[PDB]
């Protein structure tokens, strides 16, 4: 079980690199991007968000770790959506990029903290 | 164990640092304006067991940066193609794969 969970965390790192390349690609090509980027609830559509929504009965020890990564994942997707809307509508600012980078680093931090807990 | 934990910390820092690098590239294009590579050189003389792992991540890191540079030059000069983005994504995934394989070796 522990090795199963850890595999899914490492897949989330690769999948979110590809998500970011996809956003950069769609601005340069002037595309309509994809639901995983633009949907108001895009965090439900990627592989990681689906794993999260179906976990099931969690015990009291692991709960706080899972709640933190769920919340940080959602916030990262929300900042991504807002960045893309601002770029497309010609109202972007440096602050949109800073907020997105911070959201991104909070997500990787939340994943790492759960990793450490499981390994002990 | 202390040495092993030191190495593993440096590998997780590389993941965050290369996310920030990808954000900066995206930002500079829209505005129309590294630590890991220094660490690879500073590993000192290596034994024969670890050598192949280190050589693979060094090579994959270099090719990722080269694809990034070529993507940016093509965008700026207006002859970019979908293939430039695909080559960069593939370089990026080869790098993270090489890091993971070294991680697994150290843990055993
Ligand atoms: Zn996601
Ligand atoms: Zn680098």
């Amino acid at each position: 079980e522990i090795d199963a969970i850890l595999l899914n965390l490492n897949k989330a790192i690769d999948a979110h690199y590809q998500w970011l390349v996809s956003m950069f690609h769609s601005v340069v090509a002037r595309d309509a991007s994809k639901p995983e980027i633009t949907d108001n609830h895009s965090y439900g559509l990627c592989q990681f968000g689906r794993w999260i929504d179906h976990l099931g009965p969690l015990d009291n020890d692991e709960l706080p770790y899972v709640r933190l990564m769920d919340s940080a994942h959602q916030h990262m997707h929300n900042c991504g959506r807002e960045l893309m809307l601002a770029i497309v509508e010609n109202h972007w600012q440096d602050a949109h990029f800073d907020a997105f980078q911070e959201g991104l680093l909070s997500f990787t931090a939340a994943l790492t903290d759960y990793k450490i807990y499981l390994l002990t």
Side-chain angles (χ1 to χ4, degrees), chain A residues 2-101 103-120:
Chain A
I2 301 296
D3 294 308
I5 298 304
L6 281 180
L7 190 57
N8 283 307
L9 303 187
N10 302 148
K11 297 210 261 190
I13 297 295
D14 278 0
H16 288 91
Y17 271 122
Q18 302 188 76
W19 185 68
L20 180 44
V21 174
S22 177
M23 310 184 215
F24 183 11
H25 196 159
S26 93
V27 173
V28 169
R30 297 142 49 235
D31 266 335
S33 14
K34 289 132 186 143
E36 209 178 289
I37 293 81
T38 65
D39 195 282
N40 297 315
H41 306 87
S42 60
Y43 46 76
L45 299 178
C46 69
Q47 183 180 77
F48 186 75
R50 298 179 307 112
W51 179 73
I52 271 290
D53 290 339
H54 297 143
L55 276 174
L58 287 25
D59 59 18
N60 282 315
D61 296 325
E62 76 192 323
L63 191 82
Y65 296 101
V66 174
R67 288 208 196 285
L68 182 62
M69 57 184 173
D70 182 18
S71 159
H73 188 243
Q74 288 185 24
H75 185 248
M76 179 185 60
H77 278 263
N78 290 330
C79 292
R81 183 184 68 225
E82 294 177 350
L83 172 63
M84 294 289 283
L85 199 63
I87 289 167
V88 172
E89 291 188 339
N90 301 316
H91 288 287
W92 71 267
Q93 298 282 5
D94 285 350
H96 290 279
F97 284 95
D98 298 327
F100 178 76
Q101 174 165 300
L104 190 51
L105 298 174
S106 295
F107 174 65
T108 64
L111 283 201
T112 296
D113 285 345
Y114 187 40
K115 227 174 226 167
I116 289 177
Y117 162 80
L118 287 168
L119 284 173
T120 77

